[PDB]
Design an enzyme around this catalytic site. Structure first.
Site, mmCIF file in Angstrom:
data_model
loop_
_atom_site.group_PDB
_atom_site.id
_atom_site.type_symbol
_atom_site.label_atom_id
_atom_site.label_comp_id
_atom_site.label_asym_id
_atom_site.label_seq_id
_atom_site.Cartn_x
_atom_site.Cartn_y
_atom_site.Cartn_z
ATOM 1 N N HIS A 218 0.958 -1.071 0.001
ATOM 2 C CA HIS A 218 0.083 -0.020 0.053
ATOM 3 C C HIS A 218 1.069 1.193 0.082
ATOM 4 O O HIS A 218 0.423 2.001 -0.818
ATOM 5 C CB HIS A 218 -0.785 0.015 1.263
ATOM 6 C CG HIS A 218 -1.920 1.170 1.435
ATOM 7 N ND1 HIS A 218 -3.290 1.199 1.267
ATOM 8 C CD2 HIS A 218 -1.440 2.333 2.106
ATOM 9 C CE1 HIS A 218 -3.535 2.442 1.750
ATOM 10 N NE2 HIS A 218 -2.486 3.281 2.196
ATOM 11 N N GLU A 219 1.917 1.455 0.886
ATOM 12 C CA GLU A 219 2.747 2.367 1.103
ATOM 13 C C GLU A 219 3.467 2.576 -0.179
ATOM 14 O O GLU A 219 3.921 3.782 -0.899
ATOM 15 C CB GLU A 219 3.697 2.411 1.922
ATOM 16 C CG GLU A 219 3.011 2.578 3.536
ATOM 17 C CD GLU A 219 1.894 3.803 3.452
ATOM 18 O OE1 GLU A 219 2.440 4.961 2.919
ATOM 19 O OE2 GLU A 219 0.931 3.764 4.197
ATOM 20 N N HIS A 222 1.459 4.429 -2.901
ATOM 21 C CA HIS A 222 1.602 5.898 -2.840
ATOM 22 C C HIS A 222 3.064 6.388 -3.379
ATOM 23 O O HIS A 222 3.111 7.349 -4.031
ATOM 24 C CB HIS A 222 1.652 6.113 -1.329
ATOM 25 C CG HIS A 222 0.209 6.312 -0.873
ATOM 26 N ND1 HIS A 222 -0.888 6.503 -1.072
ATOM 27 C CD2 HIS A 222 -0.145 5.700 0.574
ATOM 28 C CE1 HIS A 222 -1.815 6.608 -0.078
ATOM 29 N NE2 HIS A 222 -1.477 5.907 0.794
ATOM 30 N N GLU A 257 -6.121 8.199 -0.823
ATOM 31 C CA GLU A 257 -6.247 6.746 -0.275
ATOM 32 C C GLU A 257 -7.276 5.962 -0.918
ATOM 33 O O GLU A 257 -6.789 4.768 -0.937
ATOM 34 C CB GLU A 257 -6.540 7.107 1.306
ATOM 35 C CG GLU A 257 -5.839 7.672 2.138
ATOM 36 C CD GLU A 257 -4.331 6.896 2.243
ATOM 37 O OE1 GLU A 257 -3.368 7.582 2.873
ATOM 38 O OE2 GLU A 257 -4.207 5.795 1.908
#
Ligand SMILES: CCCCCNC(=O)C[C@H](CC(=O)NO)c1ccc(Cl)cc1Cl
Ligand SMILES: [Zn+2]
EC number: 3.4.24.69
Length: 417
Positions: A218-219, A222, A257
């Site tokens: 997930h990070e 980003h 997000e």
């Protein structure tokens, strides 16, 4: 092949190349910290992040949904396990086609050389480098794309952040910048298997544990957006009106997000606003093409002008005409933009890892657990917690904190608060 070709130990001797003391430019204050280059363009710093934000230098807890432990990641044994945990998660991500694609995009996503005040030349931006102490005590500036670093005071606030710029919105103007991911492999959240329970702030104790490979992916999603300069301004938010508890507390969730989670969540970004974002970033890529075409020399002896123009032709998938001039092709822009924003998502990683996971970002976290993924008896590159040919292989039993209870210590309950 493996993504991290060397198995680092924290106590391995510095060599000034891929095990080195480094400083982060514009922090200057800081004492050098030991850092490990685990792949081209990617470094790990097994330290709590007291560096990227000068107002966040204190790990001690004040007298929320938060978790403090000022002693975490203070000893060599912890930093050794941190390093090995992070490398194991990169291998788990790289063992999937999706993670191989994402990590290739990240390594290719060199932050743009937009630090010149003169459009006749290209120049690196200082804050997309680290200063590496060489064996002779001197510093050499090394460009890099990604740093994994420990959390700051609040251990649960994992996030992808980066050094700003006076004038340029580097994460949103197509340029990109070096990304610093606050992350730990040593903790994970508990969540609930029933959607009605997981999305209710009053119910559930956190029976299943999030696989930290998903959290790191997930990070990294980003980080991919931010390295390509297409992150959505965090001020652009979904004023959540699909969950009565979100509405009661006025919780607002950034479109960045929802995009990163993917699946049904990304549909809360309306088509007109998405179209506006896509047009905005297309225009930024055109600006980069025009800057490259005006460039007539380069600062530095790291690389030639022609070399770096080609690096950014490849990063942004630019076209080149018979005169050597670059341009943005809408078809290739849409393809790259869509790869980075729709293909690389949390929901899609869940499909590749075959783990149980939250079904939406619009939930309520139930608990925080201490974990230790470093021993192969606990967690493997290929299976995470759900180890094949054990009682943990089926039904996500390895993520079931009640069945696999020796792999999880609950540190805090959030339900109720
Ligand atoms: C220490 C246990 C594991 C922590 C997991 N932290 C995260 O996923 C970070 C995440 C913010 C984000 O999405 N950044 O990209 C977050 C932060 C705080 C809270 Cl309340 C809830 C969430 Cl979803
Ligand atoms: Zn996020």
């Amino acid at each position: 092949m493996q993504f991290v070709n060397k198995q680092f130990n924290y106590k391995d001797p510095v060599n000034g190349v891929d095990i080195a003391y480094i400083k982060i430019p514009n922090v200057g204050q800081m004492q050098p910290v030991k850092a490990f280059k685990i792949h081209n363009k990617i470094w790990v710093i097994p330290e709590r992040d007291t560096f990227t934000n000068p107002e966040e230098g204190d790990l001690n807890p004040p007298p929320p949904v938060s978790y403090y432990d000022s002693t975490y990641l203070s000893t060599d044994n912890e930093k050794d396990n941190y390093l090995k945990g992070v490398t194991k998660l990169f291998e788990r991500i790289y063992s999937t086609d999706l993670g191989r694609m994402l990590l290739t995009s990240i390594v290719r996503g060199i932050p743009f050389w937009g630090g010149s005040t003169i459009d006749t030349e290209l120049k690196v931006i200082d804050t997309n480098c680290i200063n590496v102490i060489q064996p002779d005590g001197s510093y050499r500036s090394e460009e890099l794309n990604l740093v994994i670093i420990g959390p700051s005071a609040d251990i649960i606030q994992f996030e992808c952040k980066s050094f700003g710029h006076e004038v340029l919105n580097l994460t949103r103007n197509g340029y990109g910048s070096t990304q610093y991911i606050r992350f730990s492999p040593d903790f994970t959240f508990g969540f609930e298997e029933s959607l009605e329970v997981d999305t209710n702030p009053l119910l559930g104790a956190g029976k299943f544990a999030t696989d930290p490979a998903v959290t790191l992916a997930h990070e990294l999603i980003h980080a991919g957006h931010r390295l390509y300069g297409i992150a959505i301004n965090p001020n652009r938010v979904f004023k959540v009106n699909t969950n009565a508890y979100y509405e009661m507390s006025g919780l607002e969730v950034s479109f960045e997000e929802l995009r990163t989670f993917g699946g049904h969540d990304a549909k809360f970004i309306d088509s007109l606003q998405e179209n506006e974002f896509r047009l905005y970033y297309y225009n930024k890529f055109k600006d980069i093409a025009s800057t490259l075409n005006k460039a007539k020399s380069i600062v530095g002896t790291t690389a030639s002008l022609q070399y770096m123009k080609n690096v950014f032709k490849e990063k942004y998938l630019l076209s080149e005409d018979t005169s050597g001039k670059f341009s943005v092709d809408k078809l290739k822009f849409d393809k790259l933009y869509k790869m980075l924003t729709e293909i690389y998502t949390e929901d899609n990683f869940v499909k590749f890892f075959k783990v149980l996971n939250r079904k939406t970002y619009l939930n309520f976290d139930k608990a925080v657990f201490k974990i230790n993924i470093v021993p192969k008896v606990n967690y493997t590159i290929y299976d995470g917690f759900n180890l094949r040919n054990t009682n943990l292989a089926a039904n996500f039993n390895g993520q079931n904190t009640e069945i696999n209870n020796m792999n999880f210590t609950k540190l805090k309950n959030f339900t109720g608060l």
